[PDB]
């Protein structure tokens, strides 16, 4: 499991369920190419985005579609989406978990990098 | 300013106004003695809690009454309050800003300490 | 599993391992009585604090011993501990997860309440 | 002040000084056009990015160059930058403060919007 995304809802105190997540990898010409995507589960998690073979070193962007999430709950949001941009490095630990905690006008994101 | 408290509302993207704050200082007998209190202004800031003279070395607890804030807005939140516990002035006088960012089921708190 | 605690380290991007956690329940005379305690595991989680039978409605305090955590890593911290105070209510969902994200001068805490 | 950016360092408990910030605005062709840039002062604040006249309705991206900040301090962080993407001024002019709180493997961002 090279890359996992976990999302929490700070207003309801719950996993953020059915949130669209898009992962991109930066191409040689500096454009962002679609890499993987999915929707978070009932546990707020998104598994199976990629494989060890495909997840090579490079610069990745994870876009979490927070605006649509809040709108589906009838709550007025600030951001278009939450964005997490990072370099994958083979030097460090092998599993990346991108965690996000969502409020209508604020979010935090943390990388948990483990073996 | 020896001690300032600032509170923001992450649902509205606004200062958190009229938030009650109580400060305690640990006494010689290990009990929490009342030290100062007040409420946040329209800027979400609380000034004038204490003075350079009165704000001696000690262990302090800043209780931010988040439940009363949310309930006055007609919201049922998770926490009773946010509690911020820290040693102050152990290396001489510092200026402390205790900030808090509030959501119904989550909060963050940060200290900014200047010499 | 009525109550679980999960702690993350924002500096290292890792679970916060071997963090002491103390849970208290408020007594009739307003004092805090020890209720349960433990240390977080290699995954940053603390399971088995209590049982459904013992975890009755009431006001609880969870103290996460952040100062000792940072000192064991050789990093200079601000807070004595992180404190999470809440009322357990049988009305809502049945499992409480108290999550905390730690930095030397800041922390956030979120309640994830699920069935 | 139409747009202000404020950055804090959660390791030091201090303003984050000399942080580069780039603002982009989505153009008619869907590309991110450069809009304004600057760097945070000793207060961790960045003023004077734009004007009431120039800060028209649009989708804006505030890129906060967190990796360069940490590397200038001799630290290897996780993220490339923190990106804050939002529609502005769609209901008339507002004053936006975009705040960010930085840790090597985590950040939080909050918008405070006033009329």
Curated annotation (Swiss-Prot), chains A, B, C, D:
Task: Describe what happens upon changing residue 33 to G.
Answer: In AMYLD1; amyloid polyneuropathy
Q: Name one GO cellular component term.
A: extracellular space
Q: What is the effect of changing residue 46 to P?
A: In AMYLD1; amyloid polyneuropathy
Stated consequence of mutating residue 9 to E: In AMYLD1; amyloid polyneuropathy
Result, substituting residue 107 to S: In AMYLD1; amyloid polyneuropathy
Q: Which residues form a coiled coil?
A: none
MF-aspect GO terms: hormone activity; hormone binding; identical protein binding; molecular sequestering activity; protein-containing complex binding
Q: Which residues of the full protein are shown?
A: 30 to 144 of 147
Annotated phenotype, changing residue 60 to H: In AMYLD1; leptomeningeal amyloidosis; vitreous amyloid in some patients
Family note: Belongs to the transthyretin family.
Positions glycosylated per UniProt: 89
Q: What is the effect of changing residue 82 to S?
A: In AMYLD1; amyloid polyneuropathy
Q: Enumerate the residues binding L-thyroxine.
A: 6, 45, 108
Give, from the UniProt record, the effect of changing residue 45 to K.
In AMYLD1; early-onset amyloid polyneuropathy
Q: What is the effect of changing residue 115 to S?
A: In AMYLD1; uncertain significance
Instruction: Give the domain note.
Output: Each monomer has two 4-stranded beta sheets and the shape of a prolate ellipsoid. Antiparallel beta-sheet interactions link monomers into dimers. A short loop from each monomer forms the main dimer-dimer interaction. These two pairs of loops separate the opposed, convex beta-sheets of the dimers to form an internal channel.
Q: What is the effect of changing residue 75 to N?
A: In AMYLD1; vitrous amyloid
Tissue and organ distribution: Detected in serum and cerebrospinal fluid (at protein level). Highly expressed in choroid plexus epithelial cells. Detected in retina pigment epithelium and liver.
- In terms of superkingdom, the source organism counts as Eukaryota
Protein name in the entry = Transthyretin
| Keywords, comma-separated and alphabetical | Amyloid, Amyloidosis, Cytoplasm, Disease variant, Gamma-carboxyglutamic acid, Glycoprotein, Hormone, Neuropathy, Phosphoprotein, Secreted, Signal, Sulfation, Thyroid hormone, Transport
